[PDB]
Design a protein around this ligand. Structure first.
Ligand SMILES: [Cl-]
Length: 273
């Protein structure tokens, strides 16, 4: 008999089918044996966490189960197990197979202005939802590659919330952090939800320009110099819509105190609906 893995409740079953593999995370196809709907069985492990960091990892993953929002990926279950002699986190999520904003831009080359306005508003809705939880949830790792879509003319859903919690730790932040999207205060000890606004601005810039922000830079230190010197990414001057350009500028300001808030963005006339 083959050993088949299950959730502690027995509801979710793991397939021996690997869907994706990255740092700290391997995604397998799974099955809800009660509804007979296929899911994503995500196994997370950061072997360099301390005991207190792993425990916080376990607790933050378990809080994802209670999240229910149209623009957040659905996280059905979570528990702590062991993998290769050390603890790991399993995270069962809805199966996203329709691509991301990244694969969307690579497929359709450019994003039409009405699509950008609609999907950017939905990202702000999801971030507003995360920021108003108890305790508040900071994404810390928002990028076009982890904003999933339900279809070419569907909705967006913020994902990879389990992996994103590892940005709070040293080793993982240097491995999975995308410096082009990270606000400058993320290289300090303490920061707040304004880093999600900064990353949102870079997502909006990438959507508005169909290119990688700060692609002209070679490493994080180069980007950090430009950001802290008030030097915008070169793609910023390719934004054709002056209203979109004004919103991006307000989101990627180097000083957090001058940065626009989520409430300011949703109350902006561009996102009025
Ligand atoms: Cl995740």
């Amino acid at each position: 008999m083959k050993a088949v893995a299950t959730s502690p409740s027995g509801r979710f079953l793991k397939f021996d089918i690997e869907l994706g593999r990255g740092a700290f995370k391997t995604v397998y196809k799974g099955l809800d044996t009660e509804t007979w709907v296929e899911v994503a069985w995500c196994e997370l492990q950061d072997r360099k966490l301390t005991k207190a960091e792993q425990q916080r990892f376990k607790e933050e993953a378990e809080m994802l189960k209670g999240l229910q929002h149209p623009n957040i990926v659905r996280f059905y279950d979570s528990w702590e197990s062991i993998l290769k002699g050390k603890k790991c986190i399993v995270l069962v999520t809805e199966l996203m197979t329709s691509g991301t904003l990244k694969t969307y831009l690579k497929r359709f080359k450019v994003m039409k202005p009405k699509v950008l306005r609609s999907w950017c508003r939905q990202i702000l809705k999801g971030l507003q939802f995360l920021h108003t939880r108890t305790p508040p949830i900071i994404h810390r790792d928002l990028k076009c590659d982890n904003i999933f879509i339900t279809g070419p003319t569907g909705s967006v859903k913020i994902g990879d919330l389990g992996l994103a919690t590892l940005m709070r730790t040293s080793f993982a932040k240097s491995v999975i952090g995308t410096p082009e999207f990270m606000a400058p205060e993320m290289y300090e000890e303490h920061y707040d939800e304004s880093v999600d606004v900064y990353a949102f601005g870079m997502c909006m810039l990438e959507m508005a320009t169909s290119e990688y922000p700060y692609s002209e830079c070679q490493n994080a230190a180069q980007i950090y110099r430009k950001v802290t010197s008030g030097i915008k990414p070169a793609s910023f001057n390719k934004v054709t819509d002056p209203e979109v350009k004004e919103i991006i500028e307000g989101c990627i300001r180097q000083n957090k105190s001058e940065r626009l808030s989520i409430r300011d963005l949703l109350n902006h006339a561009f996102f009025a609906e």
